[PDB]
């Protein structure tokens, strides 16, 4: 499973989810095509677990880092 819904409606998402598929899931709106690629791109480095950024009205937080691999993300809608 690449994506699951938590009890509060927020999403746990695999770093490999393609950005195209992500956009379609979130109903939202390079040098990347997956969610993990996008995070590396934003930070310009491999982020710590618990770091986050805001993208297309959503907060993306790193929740699991396996070696250098951004394995799992938490997505929550702002507001």
Residue 8 marked as a ligand binder? no
Cβ atoms of residues 72 and 64 within 8 Å: yes
**CA dist., res. 73 & res. 40, Å (int):** 12
Question: What six digits make up the tokens of 56?
Answer: 């297309």
Q: Using CB under 5 A as the criterion, what x/- string covers residues 33-72 for binding Mn ion?
A: -------------------------------x-x----x-
Residue 65 marked as a ligand binder? yes
Question: DSSP secondary-structure letter at 45?
Answer: S
Q: Using CB under 5 A as the criterion, what x/- string covers residues 37-66 for binding Mg ion?
A: ---------------------------x-x
């Amino acid at each position: 499973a690449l994506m699951v819904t938590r009890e509060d409606g927020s999403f746990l998402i695999d770093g490999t989810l393609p950005i195209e598929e992500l956009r379609e899931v979130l109903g939202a709106e390079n040098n990347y095509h997956t969610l993990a690629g996008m995070c590396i791109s934003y930070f310009g480095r491999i982020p710590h677990v618990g770091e986050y950024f805001d993208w297309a009205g959503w907060r993306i937080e790193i929740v699991d880092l396996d070696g250098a691999r951004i394995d799992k993300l938490l997505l929550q809608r702002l507001n």
